Every structure is written in C-alpha cells, then in structure tokens.
Amino acid sequence: MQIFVKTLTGKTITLEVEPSDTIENVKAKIQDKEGIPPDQQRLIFAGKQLEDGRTLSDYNIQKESTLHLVLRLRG
C-alpha cells in the first residue's frame, strides 16, 4: 500500500509498504530512496513518535495515511 512521508523541508514522498512492516523497515525504505540512515530519522503520526519495533498497523496507518519525518540534524 501507499503512504506519504512529509519533511520539514516540504518534500512529500510516497512509499510502498505492508501494514505488517515495522517502523524500522520504513526507515530502511527511506534510507534506500533518500540516502538518509535510520540513525537520523524520528517518525511521527498523529502527534505520536513511532517506535522502531512496532508495526504500521499498531498505529492504524491506513492506505494514504501521511507520516511526518523529522531528521536529527543541527547547525
């Protein structure tokens, strides 16, 4: 299924995922498309931070749900 990931830089990107995918899987999928290591990603859905071990279905992420991505980066 298709979900959206939106960043604080305004990029929206689509991903193809299973509801049984862990959050860590999703991060690996972001590493592959965007080159960002899972190390650098905090993920968030309905103001909840998402734990690496839980699945997308653990949070009721439907088809066409929008996650938010924040990167652990500073200047």
Partner: protein, 172 residues
C-alpha cells in the same frame, strides 16, 4: 533534545523558534549529501528560508544560512560566517531558483558567527529580509555593512552569554 544541542538549533528547533516568534509554519531547506532541497513555493510565500547545509549520512552538524526573496526577480543569501563562506553555495542554490532569477551574497564580514549561525539566521536573517523589501531599500553594500555592525554590537558587553542563555531557555 528535539530543539537545541549545546547551542546548535536542530531542524526541529528552527521550526519551533519561528512559530514562537509568530511566523506560523515555516518551511526550511537543506543541502544534504551535496543535494539541495528547496521548496521554491514556500520561499515565495514566506519571503525567506533558513537552510541547513553541509550535512549528510556522516555529518549531523552543519551550517545554517538564510535565503531571502527581494523584490522582482532578486534573491539574497545570508551566511553568518560572512560573504566568502556564502559564496561557496551560491551556484548550487541559484540553480534551484525559478527561471530568470538572480542570487546575490549579502556582503557581511567574517569572524562573527561564534558557533551561533542558527540564532543569527533567525534574527539578523529576518532584519535583512525586511530591509531589502522596504519602501526605500538601502543598497546591498549598506545592508551587509549594517548586519556586520549588528552582529558585533550584539556580542558586545557579554552578548555571547546572553544569546546562549536565550538558546538554552528556548530548549524548554
């Protein structure tokens, strides 16, 4: 912690501090792994964009700068490290802008960043947006010189501790 680490604003914290100062939802940019991400639409609407640069898979800590929309086709880059440092990213960012536009590096002096790029971007950054967009704009030399002056007046009389006190506060 989400917003500030030591004295360095995070991606999350730069959003936060702008929202607190009353700018609504501000979109930022990045250059990550040599690759920019600039939302030209948002730069337009907002009039400016803080951009985090020199980060990547092996660098958590880079440099904040400010993209500024002037009137007409004109854009500006403010690097708190100064003009020379700002020239480094001038070409790659000018190539991200809408067709026919220009990018100029605000000519402020070096030796005043002091580790505080993110704070400078959020204060002086905005005061330069204002200046270049006002009724009778000063020249681009005046703007750069003025900013240099503001940075050093603000550091005077124990200014460093005051600014870092404020970044600490903002972390809570």
């Amino acid at each position: 912690p989400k917003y500030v680490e030591g004295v360095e604003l995070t991606q999350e914290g730069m959003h936060a501090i702008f929202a607190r100062m009353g700018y609504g939802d501000i979109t930022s940019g990045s250059i990550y792994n040599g690759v920019p991400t600039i939302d030209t639409g948002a730069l337009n609407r907002q009039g400016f964009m803080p951009v985090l640069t020199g980060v990547g898979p092996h660098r958590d800590s880079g440099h904040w700068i400010m993209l500024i929309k002037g009137p007409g086709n004109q854009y500006y880059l403010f690097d708190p490290l100064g003009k020379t440092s700002g020239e480094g990213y001038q070409n790659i960012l000018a190539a991200q802008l809408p067709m026919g536009s220009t990018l100029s590096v605000i000519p402020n002096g070096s030796g005043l960043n002091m580790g505080l790029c993110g704070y400078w971007v959020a204060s002086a950054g905005l005061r330069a947006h204002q200046a270049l967009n006002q009724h009778n704009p000063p020249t681009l030399l005046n703007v750069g010189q003025t900013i240099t002056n503001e940075m050093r007046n603000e550091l005077d009389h124990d200014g460093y501790r005051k600014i870092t006190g404020w970044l600490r506060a903002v972390a809570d």
